Amino acid sequence: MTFELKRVALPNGIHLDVVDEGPTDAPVLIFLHGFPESHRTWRHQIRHFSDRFRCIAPDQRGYRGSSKPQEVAAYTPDKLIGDIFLLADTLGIGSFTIVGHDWGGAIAWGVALGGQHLRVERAIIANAPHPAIFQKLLYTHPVQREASQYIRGFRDPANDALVKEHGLTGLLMKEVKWDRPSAMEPEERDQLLRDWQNHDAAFGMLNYYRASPIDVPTMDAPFKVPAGYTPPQLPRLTIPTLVIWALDDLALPPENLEGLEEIIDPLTIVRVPDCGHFVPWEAPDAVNAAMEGFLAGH
Numbered sequence: 001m002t003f004e005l006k007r008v009a010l011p012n013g014i015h016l017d018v019v020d021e022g023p024t025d026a027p028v029l030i031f032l033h034g035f036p037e038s039h040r041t042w043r044h045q046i047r048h049f050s051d052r053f054r055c056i057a058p059d060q061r062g063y064r065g066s067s068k069p070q071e072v073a074a075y076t077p078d079k080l081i082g083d084i085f086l087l088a089d090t091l092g093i094g095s096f097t098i099v100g101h102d103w104g105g106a107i108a109w110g111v112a113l114g115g116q117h118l119r120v121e122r123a124i125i126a127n128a129p130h131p132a133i134f135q136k137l138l139y140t141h142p143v144q145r146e147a148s149q150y151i152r153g154f155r156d157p158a159n160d161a162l163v164k165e166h167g168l169t170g171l172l173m174k175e176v177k178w179d180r181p182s183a184m185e186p187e188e189r190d191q192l193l194r195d196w197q198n199h200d201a202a203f204g205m206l207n208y209y210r211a212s213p214i215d216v217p218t219m220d221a222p223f224k225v226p227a228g229y230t231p232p233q234l235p236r237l238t239i240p241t242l243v244i245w246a247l248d249d250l251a252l253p254p255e256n257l258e259g260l261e262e263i264i265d266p267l268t269i270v271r272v273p274d275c276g277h278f279v280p281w282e283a284p285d286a287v288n289a290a291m292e293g294f295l296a297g298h
Helices: 039-049 077-090 103-115 134-140 143-149 147-154 157-174 186-195 199-211 286-293
Strands: 005-009 017-020 028-032 054-059 096-101 120-126 241-245 266-270
Touching: 005 077, 017 039, 028 039, 028 077, 028 103, 028 157, 039 054, 039 096, 039 186, 039 286, 054 077, 054 266, 077 103, 096 103, 134 143, 143 147, 147 157, 157 199, 186 241, 199 241, 241 286, 266 286
Parallel strands: 028 054, 028 096, 096 120, 120 241, 241 266
Antiparallel strands: 005 017, 017 054
């Protein structure tokens, strides 16, 4: 399966290749993939909703044919969040629902929190931790700290020799702490294996972790918030928000949902039992069902 991509030049000097399907003046859903995927992550939802919604899905910075600057700092969270507002600007989209999975969901939380009521009318987040919650969990909760040890591997510049020899695939093969995808259609797998052979993309994709200010301690460090840690002041999220959470995601255990109710209103949580990390395509019918109910005009 293939979507037509268009190249969108942005005023920060980046271009993004993007899916743009559906009626031009329909309500907009902007879909953000995570690592190590592509605009294809939300394929099932894009095809499901593009009869009624304008569906935008970029290959984000660092991915596939989009700009792949090699410097780590080109991937700081502000830049990744900024790319989405600039993409909406360039396409003439005043307000949209932001939809994100994994890194796309982390970016989506930022987009929603910053842009709510001005640019962002609803948020849909699937298996991506909330920035008010995640850093604290890494400090306090062994389940989460253990779950996130792969990030330390992805950050280790001693692994770059392996990426240069074997593409991203070599590091994914080597990094046993990384939670691997479940069974996917052969055509989808083939595309990713081809994508992962591009050196510049492999590093751009890894740079999300390398540029992130998130602190993932070793399992040796005390399970307490450091004395000098100041929790970023965030606003509450006061746009309609759907959080979808596959319960067998080994990277992002369900503890990530604790505390969401206090900081989001109106919040809907849809737990997906017996499903791993890649929920948009591992459980597309549950995801489509959740989105249908949530997006309904009543």
